[PDB]
Design a protein around this motif. Structure first.
Motif, PDB file in Angstrom:
ATOM      1  N   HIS A  31     -66.457 -15.931 -12.721  1.00  0.00           N
ATOM      2  CA  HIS A  31     -66.384 -15.620 -14.164  1.00  0.00           C
ATOM      3  C   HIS A  31     -66.016 -13.871 -14.012  1.00  0.00           C
ATOM      4  CE1 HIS A  31     -67.250 -19.204 -16.476  1.00  0.00           C
ATOM      5  NE2 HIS A  31     -68.415 -19.201 -15.859  1.00  0.00           N
ATOM      6  N   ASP A  32     -66.720 -13.366 -13.211  1.00  0.00           N
ATOM      7  CA  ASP A  32     -66.263 -11.811 -13.022  1.00  0.00           C
ATOM      8  C   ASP A  32     -64.974 -11.733 -12.621  1.00  0.00           C
ATOM      9  OD1 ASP A  32     -68.834 -11.520 -13.920  1.00  0.00           O
ATOM     10  OD2 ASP A  32     -69.941 -11.150 -12.002  1.00  0.00           O
ATOM     11  N   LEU A  33     -64.561 -12.601 -11.679  1.00  0.00           N
ATOM     12  CA  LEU A  33     -63.145 -12.333 -10.953  1.00  0.00           C
ATOM     13  C   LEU A  33     -62.288 -12.731 -12.166  1.00  0.00           C
ATOM     14  CD1 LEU A  33     -61.099 -11.683  -9.075  1.00  0.00           C
ATOM     15  CD2 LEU A  33     -61.437 -14.287  -7.969  1.00  0.00           C
ATOM     16  N   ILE A  34     -62.259 -13.696 -12.879  1.00  0.00           N
ATOM     17  CA  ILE A  34     -61.332 -14.188 -13.924  1.00  0.00           C
ATOM     18  C   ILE A  34     -61.353 -13.029 -15.053  1.00  0.00           C
ATOM     19  CG2 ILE A  34     -60.989 -15.797 -15.704  1.00  0.00           C
ATOM     20  CD1 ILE A  34     -62.128 -17.800 -13.958  1.00  0.00           C
ATOM     21  N   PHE A  35     -62.608 -12.383 -15.336  1.00  0.00           N
ATOM     22  CA  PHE A  35     -62.697 -11.419 -16.492  1.00  0.00           C
ATOM     23  C   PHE A  35     -61.797 -10.171 -15.921  1.00  0.00           C
ATOM     24  CE2 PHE A  35     -64.475  -7.581 -18.313  1.00  0.00           C
ATOM     25  CZ  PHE A  35     -64.783  -8.099 -19.614  1.00  0.00           C
ATOM     26  N   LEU A  36     -61.990  -9.816 -14.533  1.00  0.00           N
ATOM     27  CA  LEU A  36     -61.117  -8.683 -14.167  1.00  0.00           C
ATOM     28  C   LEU A  36     -59.534  -8.993 -14.300  1.00  0.00           C
ATOM     29  CD1 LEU A  36     -61.242  -6.043 -12.069  1.00  0.00           C
ATOM     30  CD2 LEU A  36     -60.830  -7.838 -10.182  1.00  0.00           C
ATOM     31  N   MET A  37     -59.203 -10.053 -14.047  1.00  0.00           N
ATOM     32  CA  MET A  37     -57.639 -10.554 -13.994  1.00  0.00           C
ATOM     33  C   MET A  37     -57.329 -10.672 -15.460  1.00  0.00           C
ATOM     34  SD  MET A  37     -56.905 -14.353 -13.439  1.00  0.00           S
ATOM     35  CE  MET A  37     -55.295 -14.336 -14.556  1.00  0.00           C
ATOM     36  N   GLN A  38     -58.220 -10.697 -16.545  1.00  0.00           N
ATOM     37  CA  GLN A  38     -58.040 -10.989 -17.925  1.00  0.00           C
ATOM     38  C   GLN A  38     -58.008  -9.604 -18.618  1.00  0.00           C
ATOM     39  OE1 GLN A  38     -60.940 -12.494 -20.306  1.00  0.00           O
ATOM     40  NE2 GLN A  38     -59.660 -13.487 -21.865  1.00  0.00           N
ATOM     41  N   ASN A  39     -58.785  -8.756 -18.216  1.00  0.00           N
ATOM     42  CA  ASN A  39     -58.866  -7.470 -19.148  1.00  0.00           C
ATOM     43  C   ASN A  39     -58.732  -6.247 -18.015  1.00  0.00           C
ATOM     44  OD1 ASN A  39     -60.423  -8.661 -21.595  1.00  0.00           O
ATOM     45  ND2 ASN A  39     -61.447  -9.728 -19.712  1.00  0.00           N
ATOM     46  N   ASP A  40     -58.619  -6.188 -17.083  1.00  0.00           N
ATOM     47  CA  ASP A  40     -58.254  -4.870 -16.444  1.00  0.00           C
ATOM     48  C   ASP A  40     -56.716  -4.561 -16.012  1.00  0.00           C
ATOM     49  OD1 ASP A  40     -61.208  -5.322 -16.372  1.00  0.00           O
ATOM     50  OD2 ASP A  40     -61.329  -3.327 -15.302  1.00  0.00           O
ATOM     51  N   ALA A  41     -56.038  -4.105 -16.830  1.00  0.00           N
ATOM     52  CA  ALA A  41     -54.900  -3.577 -16.729  1.00  0.00           C
ATOM     53  C   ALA A  41     -54.495  -2.928 -15.404  1.00  0.00           C
ATOM     54  CB  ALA A  41     -54.098  -3.099 -17.828  1.00  0.00           C
ATOM     55  N   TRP A  42     -55.416  -2.205 -14.909  1.00  0.00           N
ATOM     56  CA  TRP A  42     -55.203  -1.347 -13.461  1.00  0.00           C
ATOM     57  C   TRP A  42     -55.089  -2.304 -12.316  1.00  0.00           C
ATOM     58  CZ3 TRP A  42     -58.930  -2.215  -9.863  1.00  0.00           C
ATOM     59  CH2 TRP A  42     -60.108  -2.521 -10.522  1.00  0.00           C
ATOM     60  N   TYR A  43     -55.673  -3.407 -12.638  1.00  0.00           N
ATOM     61  CA  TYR A  43     -55.626  -4.582 -11.479  1.00  0.00           C
ATOM     62  C   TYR A  43     -54.856  -5.621 -11.511  1.00  0.00           C
ATOM     63  CZ  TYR A  43     -57.281  -8.703  -8.970  1.00  0.00           C
ATOM     64  OH  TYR A  43     -57.365  -9.795  -8.298  1.00  0.00           O
ATOM     65  N   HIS A  44     -54.591  -6.225 -12.899  1.00  0.00           N
ATOM     66  CA  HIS A  44     -53.497  -7.140 -12.808  1.00  0.00           C
ATOM     67  C   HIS A  44     -52.021  -6.974 -12.988  1.00  0.00           C
ATOM     68  CE1 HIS A  44     -52.755  -6.719 -17.264  1.00  0.00           C
ATOM     69  NE2 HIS A  44     -54.108  -6.890 -17.433  1.00  0.00           N
ATOM     70  N   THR A  45     -51.546  -5.640 -13.416  1.00  0.00           N
ATOM     71  CA  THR A  45     -50.388  -5.108 -13.470  1.00  0.00           C
ATOM     72  C   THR A  45     -49.835  -4.985 -12.200  1.00  0.00           C
ATOM     73  OG1 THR A  45     -51.101  -2.891 -13.614  1.00  0.00           O
ATOM     74  CG2 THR A  45     -50.369  -4.053 -15.874  1.00  0.00           C
ATOM     75  N   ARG A  46     -50.780  -4.580 -11.098  1.00  0.00           N
ATOM     76  CA  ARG A  46     -50.328  -4.320  -9.877  1.00  0.00           C
ATOM     77  C   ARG A  46     -50.243  -5.934  -9.162  1.00  0.00           C
ATOM     78  NH1 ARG A  46     -47.541  -1.112  -7.121  1.00  0.00           N
ATOM     79  NH2 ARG A  46     -48.464   0.397  -8.834  1.00  0.00           N
ATOM     80  N   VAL A  47     -51.285  -6.502  -9.338  1.00  0.00           N
ATOM     81  CA  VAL A  47     -51.369  -7.840  -8.713  1.00  0.00           C
ATOM     82  C   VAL A  47     -50.190  -8.950  -9.167  1.00  0.00           C
ATOM     83  CG1 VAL A  47     -52.740 -10.050  -8.662  1.00  0.00           C
ATOM     84  CG2 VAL A  47     -53.779  -7.848  -8.438  1.00  0.00           C
ATOM     85  N   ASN A  48     -49.920  -8.970 -10.422  1.00  0.00           N
ATOM     86  CA  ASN A  48     -48.703  -9.633 -11.069  1.00  0.00           C
ATOM     87  C   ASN A  48     -47.551  -9.020 -10.396  1.00  0.00           C
ATOM     88  OD1 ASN A  48     -50.518 -11.291 -12.460  1.00  0.00           O
ATOM     89  ND2 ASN A  48     -50.280  -9.956 -14.065  1.00  0.00           N
ATOM     90  N   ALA A  49     -47.285  -7.835 -10.277  1.00  0.00           N
ATOM     91  CA  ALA A  49     -46.187  -7.182  -9.725  1.00  0.00           C
ATOM     92  C   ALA A  49     -45.878  -7.793  -8.327  1.00  0.00           C
ATOM     93  CB  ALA A  49     -45.935  -5.626  -9.867  1.00  0.00           C
ATOM     94  N   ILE A  50     -47.050  -7.625  -7.581  1.00  0.00           N
ATOM     95  CA  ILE A  50     -46.706  -7.992  -6.093  1.00  0.00           C
ATOM     96  C   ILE A  50     -46.716  -9.510  -5.890  1.00  0.00           C
ATOM     97  CG2 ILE A  50     -47.963  -7.940  -3.870  1.00  0.00           C
ATOM     98  CD1 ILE A  50     -49.205  -5.262  -4.616  1.00  0.00           C
ATOM     99  N   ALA A  51     -47.428  -9.948  -6.686  1.00  0.00           N
ATOM    100  CA  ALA A  51     -47.171 -11.718  -6.434  1.00  0.00           C
ATOM    101  C   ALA A  51     -46.026 -12.192  -6.903  1.00  0.00           C
ATOM    102  CB  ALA A  51     -48.320 -12.342  -7.264  1.00  0.00           C
TER     103      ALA A  51
END
Lengths: 817, 822
Positions: free
Chosen positions: B471-491
């Motif tokens: 749940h915490d990992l999913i939350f990180l991917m849902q709400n923290d733009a500093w994390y998911h913008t980077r992750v999405n761009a690389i993926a």
């Protein structure tokens, strides 16, 4: 101390002829006087002058020779000898001078008419003088100037014979003649100790105590050799002492002190209430006597050791006594043999004796080195230019030099066989163009193997090969000069192949010699060397030092000093480490090769084991035999005007001469050659590290999925979906994770041949074949990682625990899957 | 030259639905007051007053107008040239505001019918329909004018179309749509079906083109099925006499007997008429084979089956008489819903035609590199010590940035995540401590760097077991733009200036976030998801005419399949990769991307076939990881107005389609390769086994022992130790040495049995005898070691390998098991 020229009483013809003339014209003739004119008979042969005759005369001559010999030694040892007016010493006596002494000694007793020594001294010595001059005059043309320089010289030695004024300390001539006459006076007269002490003390100032012991020890041997009785010695003898000079006595008075004024007493004079003649044991204990005579506390056995009374007495009454008194060549031959033995006996005495005359058994490195030589000879393919490469090991120049220097290559050769000998030709064919360089730089290089095949070899069996190898080393200087220098570690600019060949040939040459040599070993060999003036002078000096510290003794054994000096000055290595060429004929090295250095090698105990060559013999010196010098002579000049010397050497064997090498040098490299390659096992670990063929598994997965799905037969589609596909997905994961448990289980899930045979379609049959290949694939990994590899690991573990019966068990009892 | 449509629809517009509702309540739902066909009819118990010209008929006409304008706009984008009106406009120029007015008029076009007359009271019925429309507008002037109708002049225009005073059926778009729409519904099951179809096809054809006209009449039959009407077959070889439809007459073949012409030109002999013996009626099959018909009509020689595919004749009739037929004729919201479903299916069906079919909806099973990728991810996760600034170092292998970008691009992360377990999830905390100070960067370069592991530990995590971590990992991917913008761009392989560790985390987290999603989600999968994007103006316009090109080349058809052109344009203009390769955030509520996030681009993602497998995020929020063989094909583009910042907002409606034609081709071994090298055995035991067999014998020891034995022998000590040494010990040492100098195992095996027994040694008790036994045992062990190795073990292992090299595993095991004793 000049070098002697080799002059000897036993080889000079001039002195020998003077001894014949003396015997022939006096001496062998009956006495014309009254006293003891009656002849004596020994073994049926008559002697006219038993006492003062030929044997007596010849011994005086022999005494003079050894007195001079011992004086020169004492001088070289640092001893101060009694000097004459001109400051000379008995050691300064020259060969030419000594010859003139002996000739005069030959006549010193010819002018006797009987055995009276209490009168007629003047007349008899006048007659002896006349007899001597008569000889000189008769052989005038011969004796001057070569022997005597003029008539004034002849007069001098005639004056010594006449003995007008008893000037017995005027010159070496007067001394040697007087001393020589007095040394023969030690016979059996009692008490023996008083006589020995007196004549010992007369000679002692001139040559020293060590030299004087040697003369009177040698004198006893000369007596045995000429069949005269030899007295015993007892320092504790209780007889009354005999003051020889005047035949008187010394006395003990009641103060219990020897009477001194020390005071001479006549045998007639009466003694008081408490006076008694001092006994010999008391005489030998005096501080003044012990200081000049080492006889105190000592004992000597009379007669001959090994002989009993009746045997010794029968020997004295042999015809050989008469032969000594009548035959010049016989009596001189007896003395010569005894004189030669006194040079050898003290040497053997100074070292630990041995009873084994043969070479010792092989040591571990000699055995190993023999194995290595045999392998090289069998595989000459292993021979390169810089090295030998044999069984994953590299042998360089150092290794083969260590073999040459530490191994007895005659022993190594005894471990070689006829296969090794035959393989010489193939080594030679392999080295057909290998160039050998003579140590003489002017010489052109010779092709080793080619010269072997074209001019030396002649077909035949192994015995012919042995003869040709011996022939090569005997006759080809381009070969043997290099080999000898490398074997003795005194070579310059040698190629590795020259060194290797030497290391290979030397033991094989020794084998070839031991197998072909037939004759019994000669006991006198001669060796020729050409040495630098510097090196020969070293050898001369080392030899003279050894000879000077090797002396016979009566009471004082100096064997410890002989031991010390021999080990310091031993030059036996000059004749060691190689198959040294020798001859029974001295003229081979002396005249043909014109050598400046000649070794007269004497081997009377049969310790050298010379092998005949093709009068050439070959010597490979045993490690514990020394060639000890006993004589050094100047032999004149060679063809090139260089000085030539002869070294007479005696072979002596002892554990004391054994070298101590540290082992391992040959065993080591041998062990590393036995190292197993084990290439099958190295091929098992490479196969066990091969990645599984997953593409093959995938290919069949794809093929099944293509037909899983494009066919309207229901039984085939199920079979592929429920029986084939899961096994493949199970096999893929098994090979990918390398999980043994999952591989060994899917094995049973592979459908049978009959379950596959239900579908006789083309693609089903080809799939079968590819499914079988995967099954084999899966099985070989399941057995390796699951059964075999664990077993090997279990085997190894029991091996480092030394559980041998357990290591075998890990292989024998393999658990099933 | 084709303006973007504003999403106006017959099925969502409230005004048109109201007009149809009024038309039914006041006219179409009331009994006919006339004579012919005035009697009501039942369907499943429900009574229908106007079977022929009623509500279902009227609502289809409105559906025809929509698809006609739709297909007309597509025809224009394909470059086709359409028939113009007096003002120079074509049907493709019809605006949403104008189409609504037309549909309102269409709703009343039949309201004035008193019965089902034929050719008697046209003017009367059409005047009553006009007055009905005027009455409706007046009663609703407050809402209808001026929003819908500009003024009374405008109202009069559409009233004049309804009245149809001069039969000017080609005067304007309204005249054509109303008149053609009315006709298109006449393609019933009347005989012969071919004469009717060819005719109405030829009337529509000049206005939109053949491709569009084919699409309209294909869709028409689906509208017929949806509204439970009978659908006629088509047979080019029908021998029945041709019916001219304008005249309800015939054509005639003479004794010649080529058809009778004029002038050429066909005729129209009244069916009542009566002619010569030497003449008969022109057949349908003869009419379709004419050159003039074949150049204007693409349906001969072709065939169309009647009824519903899959149903027999008895089942079709039980359907045609269902109660749903009566519901289509009486319920506005039901009939419209039936048509909306059919209309929507006509947009999906042609797309599936252009590609291979797929049977299975679920993700495929793991392939070999995905199985390997899961192992590698698990082992990095188990030992974070293997993580370095430049690479990962696992089991002797070096994994660099390209290796992880390759997993992100070639592996289905969702599948990889399916191969992970709770231990791996639990190990995220261990990973995050090792990456405590690792800085993550948003794509927004104005944002400050955030320390990953420290923020995870102190802000993201809330304790608990594995499920809470997920749940915490999913939350990180849902709400923290500093994390998911980077992750999405690389993926998605569209990042710039990313660190190695950012790539690594993306490669480790993506499959871990998928597992978390799959393990925690419990919602049934929704079939309509909304995704918002903030795109540049350049990029959006590119996506727009990419979508418009695809849509213009996707059509239904009767006779001419243009599937290959659909295939070609979709692969050319596909933008499915905008939603691929990453855990993509979506919502069931369009107002989330539209209002809250204020996106200028919205994807209306439709998944009727259940191909996307979305998982609920923490509600209306979902996450999709696009399968490798699913494309998001556009079927509709709408202008949606302005955002908060005055930028234009567009809605792309995408349909999930699965096909092997979408399967990407990657070379295997990209992950399997390095894994296999990490499993290569470093078989140390066997290597020790080899080195043991290389160890040398201490020959010096055996030789030195011989010396001692001899030196011990030549002194008689104990009886008869001396004889024992000379006759039992010494020969053994000699044989042992010779057996060790050579490698002869036969000598060695023999001498082992020759070593004295302990009992024989027990006879001597001296210090030197015991000292000798101990040394003798050492030599024996030395002999045994090599007699066993060289004589038994080493050749056994060699024969095993030789059997394996011949692939004879049976013999390989016999090599170890059947070791003979010395």
């Amino acid at each position: 101390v000049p070098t002697w020229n080799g002059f000897s009483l036993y080889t000079d013809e001039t002195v020998r002829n003077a001894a014949r003339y003396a015997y022939d014209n006096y001496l062998g003739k009956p006495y014309t006087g009254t006293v003891e004119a009656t002849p004596v008979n020994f073994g049926g042969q008559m002697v006219y002058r038993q006492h003062h005759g030929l044997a007596h005369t010849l011994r005086t001559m022999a005494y003079a020779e050894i007195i001079v010999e011992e004086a020169r030694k004492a001088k070289l040892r640092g001893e101060s000898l009694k000097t004459f007016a001109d400051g000379r010493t008995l050691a300064d006596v020259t060969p030419e001078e000594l010859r003139k002494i002996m000739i005069a000694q030959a006549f010193f007793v010819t002018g006797r008419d009987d055995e009276e020594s209490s009168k007629n001294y003047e007349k008899y010595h006048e007659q002896s003088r006349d007899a001597f001059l008569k000889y000189v005059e008769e052989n005038k043309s011969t004796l001057i100037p070569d022997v005597f320089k003029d008539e004034k010289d002849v007069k001098f030695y005639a004056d010594v014979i006449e003995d007008k004024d008893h000037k017995w300390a005027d010159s070496p001539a007067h001394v040697l003649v007087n001393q020589g006459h007095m040394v023969d006076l030690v016979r059996v007269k009692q008490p023996p100790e008083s006589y020995l002490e007196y004549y010992f003390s007369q000679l002692q100032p001139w040559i020293g105590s060590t030299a004087t012991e040697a003369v009177f020890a040698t004198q006893r041997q000369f007596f045995h050799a000429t069949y005269e009785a030899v007295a015993g010695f007892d320092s504790e003898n209780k007889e009354p002492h005999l003051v020889v000079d005047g035949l008187g006595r010394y006395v003990i008075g009641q103060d219990g002190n020897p009477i001194r004024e020390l005071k001479f007493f006549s045998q007639k004079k009466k003694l008081e209430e408490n006076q008694r003649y001092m006994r010999v044991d008391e005489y030998l204990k005096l501080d003044e006597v012990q200081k000049r005579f080492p006889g105190a506390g000592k004992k000597l056995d009379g007669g001959l050791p090994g002989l009993k009374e009746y045997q010794y007495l029968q020997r004295l009454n042999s015809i050989n006594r008469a032969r000594c008194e009548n035959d010049v060549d016989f009596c001189l031959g007896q003395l010569q043999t005894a004189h030669h033995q006194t040079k050898i006996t003290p040497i053997k005495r100074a070292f630990q004796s041995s009873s084994e005359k043969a070479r010792r058994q092989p040591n571990m490195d000699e055995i190993a080195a023999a194995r290595i030589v045999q392998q090289i000879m069998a595989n000459p393919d292993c021979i390169h230019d810089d090295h030998v490469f044999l069984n994953g090991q590299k042998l360089e120049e150092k290794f083969f030099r260590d073999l040459l220097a530490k191994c007895d290559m005659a022993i190594v050769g005894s471990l070689l066989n006829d296969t090794d000998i035959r393989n010489i030709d193939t080594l030679m064919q392999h080295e057909r163009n290998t160039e050998f360089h003579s140590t003489d730089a002017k010489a052109k290089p010779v092709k080793l193997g080619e010269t072997w095949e074209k001019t030396i070899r002649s077909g035949g069996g192994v015995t012919q090969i042995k003869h040709d190898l011996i022939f090569l080393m005997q006759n080809d200087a381009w070969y043997h000069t290099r080999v000898n220098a490398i074997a003795q570690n005194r070579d310059k600019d040698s190629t590795f192949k020259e060194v290797l060949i030497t290391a290979l040939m030397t033991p094989l040459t020794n084998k070839s010699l031991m197998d072909t040599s037939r004759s019994p070993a000669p006991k006198t060999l001669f060796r020729g060397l050409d040495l630098s003036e510097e090196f020969k002078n070293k050898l001369i000096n080392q030899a003279e030092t050894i000879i000077a510290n090797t002396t016979e003794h009566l009471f004082t054994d100096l064997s410890t000093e002989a031991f010390k000096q021999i080990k310091l000055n031993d030059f036996s290595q000059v004749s060691a480490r190689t198959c040294a060429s020798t001859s029974t004929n001295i003229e081979v090295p002396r005249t043909i090769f014109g050598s400046n250095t000649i070794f007269e090698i004497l081997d009377p105990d049969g310790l050298l084991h010379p092998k005949q060559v093709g009068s050439e013999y070959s010597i490979y010196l045993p490690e514990d035999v020394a060639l000890v010098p006993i004589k050094v002579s100047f032999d004149g000049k060679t063809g090139k005007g260089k000085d030539r010397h002869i070294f007479t050497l005696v072979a002596v064997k002892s554990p004391d001469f054994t070298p101590r090498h540290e082992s391992g040098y040959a065993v080591g490299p041998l062990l590393k050659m036995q190292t197993p390659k084990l290439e099958e096992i190295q091929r098992l670990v490479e196969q066990a590290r091969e990645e599984p063929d997953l593409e093959r598994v995938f290919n069949l997965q794809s093929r099944v999925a293509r037909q899983a799905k494009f066919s309207t037969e229901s039984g085939y589609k199920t079979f592929l979906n429920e029986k084939v596909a899961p096994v493949l997905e199970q096999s893929l994961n098994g090979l990918l994770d390398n999980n043994v448990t999952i591989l060994g289980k899917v094995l049973s899930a592979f459908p049978s041949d009959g379950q596959w045979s239900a579908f006789n379609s083309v693609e089903a049959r080809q799939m079968k074949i590819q499914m079988d290949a995967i099954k084999q694939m899966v099985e070989k990994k399941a057995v390796l990682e699951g059964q075999i590899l664990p077993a090997l690991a279990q085997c190894q573990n029991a091996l480092e625990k030394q559980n041998i019966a357990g290591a075998l068990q890990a292989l024998r009892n393999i658990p099933s899957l």
